[PDB]
Every structure is written in structure tokens, then in C-alpha cells.
Design a protein around this ligand. Structure first.
Ligand code: DQB
Ligand code: GRF
Length: 200
């Protein structure tokens, strides 16, 4: 399966996916890395891995529903089968989410029905949970609500801050995102027909 990874920053999850898809038994290959920003460290990791890089900005064209079209163009260009959102700070439009339905994955820093949004760790800490974690799910039109593929629990320590908690959770993200990509790329897991995850 041909894969496109979309980023916005450092790209620690991108690197994990790079290392994983480089293994001999990987059913996925990363063919293109797209960023909505330009001075992101994620691009260097991509280039350092010999992966074509391509950046798309907003101040460079029109509104949104068109921004996704520019992305989708490069997607068709590289004959992509699966899309991985790795820290992409940009909500995709209904048409795009519709086209890649069941073919786009996202990694979220919480045990998903809980703490949807871009500040999951602050929410977790504010709420006082002693257990949080991360989730890999299929991207649906409604933010952080698509079908769940894998999840991993991570403890919250007393005195934790966004900095220390995110560091602990990232270790789990680097494990399940690559594993989840392999499950989908190999055909072991698919969105199914009844909308729910299916394990062939
Ligand atoms: N339709 C669909 N598209 C998505 C696009 C990105 C992400 C990544 N998780 C994200 C979820 C939310 C944001 C967010 O609210 N950003 C700041 C405001 C900018 C904006 O309004 O976009 C960013 C990434 C998940 C989804 C998803 O579940 N469904
Ligand atoms: N995808 C979301 O974005 C954060 C930054 O990831 P990375 O781009 O450094 O890998 C991740 O920890 C995750 O919650």
C-alpha cells in the first residue's frame, strides 16, 4: 500500500512510521510527506529518509474546500492508497473526508471518547484522571469520532504537566500508530460495511 503522511511540526510520529515502514515485512511504503507549514522539522526527517516532500500553505490560494483539493492533487499524483494524519493542524472538509473514507488514519493523544480536541492533555490534567492514553482511528467527518483501530493506556503521575505527560504518551503513540498502519495496509483491518471496524 502506498502511503501519504501529512504533518505540521516536528514529526516524531512520522519518524516512527518511517522506521516501521522500512522493515522488510512492512505492507506499507511512505511515498510522500505533506506539510501545511514550511519550517517544520518533520520535512527534514522526510528528506533525510529520501522521501519526496511537498508543502501547501493557505495564504497561497483560496478558502478551504479548495485547500484539500491541492492536497488531494498530490495524493492522486503519487497514486496514494492510505493517508496518515501525523500531527496535522487542519480540519479536513466533508468532501475530502468522504473521498478517503476508510483510507485515512489519525493518532490522538487520549483514550478517545474522552477529551476530543487539540488540547487533550490539558483536559486530562484539568479533569484529574489517573489514566489516559492515545488512540488511532479512521478519520470521520465529525472530528475525533471515527471508528477506533487501536488504543493504549498510559498512567498520569501526580505533578504531571503537559510536558511530562505528552512525553510519556508519545512513547505509546510510537507503538500503536505504526502497528495500526500495518493492520490497515495489510488488509487485516478495514472500515467494513456496517460502519464498525472489521478484523478479517
Ligand atoms: N473531518 C475530520 N477532519 C480531521 C482533521 C484533522 C484531525 C486531526 N485532529 C485535529 C482536531 C482538531 C484540530 C483543531 O481544532 N485545530 C485548531 C483550529 C483549526 C481548525 O479549525 O481546523 C486540529 C487537529 C482529525 C479530523 C477528524 O477526526 N475529522
Ligand atoms: N498527532 C498528534 O500530534 C502530536 C504531535 O506529534 P508529532 O508531529 O510530534 O509526531 C502527537 O503527540 C499527537 O497527539
Amino acid at each position: 500500500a502506498r502511503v501519504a503522511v501529512l504533518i505540521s511540526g516536528t514529526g516524531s510520529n512520522l519518524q516512527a512510521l518511517i522506521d516501521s515502514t522500512r522493515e522488510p515485512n512492512s505492507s506499507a511504503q511512505i511515498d510522500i510527506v505533506i506539510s501545511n507549514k514550511a519550517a517544520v522539522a518533520g520535512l527534514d526527517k522526510a528528506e533525510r529518509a529520501g522521501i519526496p516532500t511537498r508543502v501547501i500553505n493557505h495564504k497561497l490560494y483560496k478558502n478551504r474546500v479548495e485547500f484539500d483539493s491541492a492536497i488531494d492533487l498530490v495524493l492522486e499524483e503519487f497514486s496514494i492508497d492510505i493517508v496518515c494524519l501525523a500531527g496535522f493542524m487542519r480540519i479536513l472538509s466533508g468532501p475530502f473526508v468522504q473521498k478517503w473514507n476508510g483510507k485515512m488514519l489519525n493518532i490522538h493523544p487520549s483514550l478517545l471518547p474522552s477529551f476530543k480536541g487539540s488540547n487533550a492533555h490539558e483536559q486530562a490534567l484539568e479533569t484529574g484522571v489517573t489514566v489516559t492514553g492515545c488512540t488511532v482511528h479512521f478519520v470521520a467527518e465529525d472530528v475525533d469520532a471515527g471508528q477506533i483501530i487501536l488504543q493504549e493506556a498510559v498512567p498520569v503521575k501526580r505533578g504531571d504537566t503537559v510536558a511530562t505527560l505528552s512525553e510519556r504518551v508519545k512513547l505509546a503513540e510510537h507503538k500503536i500508530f505504526p502497528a495500526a498502519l500495518q493492520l490497515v495496509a495489510s488488509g487485516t483491518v478495514q472500515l467494513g460495511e456496517n460502519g464498525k471496524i472489521c478484523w478479517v
